[PDB]
Amino acid sequence: GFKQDIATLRGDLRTYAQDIFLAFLNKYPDEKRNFKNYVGKSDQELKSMAKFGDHTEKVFNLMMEVADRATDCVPLASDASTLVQMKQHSGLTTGNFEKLFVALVEYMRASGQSFDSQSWDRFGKNLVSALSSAGMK
Numbered sequence: 001g002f003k004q005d006i007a008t009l010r011g012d013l014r015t016y017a018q019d020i021f022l023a024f025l026n027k028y029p030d031e032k033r034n035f036k037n038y039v040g041k042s043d044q045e046l047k048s049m050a051k052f053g054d055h056t057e058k059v060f061n062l063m064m065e066v067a068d069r070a071t072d073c074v075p076l077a078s079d080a081s082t083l084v085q086m087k088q089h090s091g092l093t094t095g096n097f098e099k100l101f102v103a104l105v106e107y108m109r110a111s112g113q114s115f116d117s118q119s120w121d122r123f124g125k126n127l128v129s130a131l132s133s134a135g136m137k
């Protein structure tokens, strides 16, 4: 289920992070402009860029901690707060997270592994919800 899925992603996290994030950037090409230097790059080009690799891993390093501290796919109120306050991230939006999670659920759906994709779908919704309530627009 959801807990075992955290262990599976964590076990090859750099490749899972890049591949789901690329699935996000390719489903919603308008997202690349939040990472402007990403625009007009192939998947293999992005994967060559230091900050792409490092940043996508840290996104996922963080989202796996929030998934691990969640109960029944509901994150800690405290976790959403910290995220809304995050230095250098004043401009994050909940609509951009819902897009990330759509991409993550389709990825898990299209894989031949027993991911609990309904659970991630729930988690995605519940994280947006907690982000909304913590004051992310």
Ligand code: FDE
Binding pocket: 034, 035, 036, 051, 055, 058, 059, 062, 088, 089, 092
């Ligand atoms: C969703 C999400 C999540 C996250 C998380 C995180 C963690 C844990 C950590 C981090 C870090 C970071 N960020 Fe982070 N993140 C994100 C996003 C983002 C964006 C959009 C940006 C912008 C970029 C520019 O260009 O400015 C960022 C951003 C960021 C930064 C700066 C940039 C560079 O160049 O490097 C940093 C350092 N981020 N991060």
Ligand SMILES: Cc1cc(Br)ccc1O
Binding pocket: 034, 091, 092, 093, 094, 096, 097, 100
């Ligand atoms: C640009 C952006 C990306 C992600 Br992933 C989440 C939020 C946000 O505003």
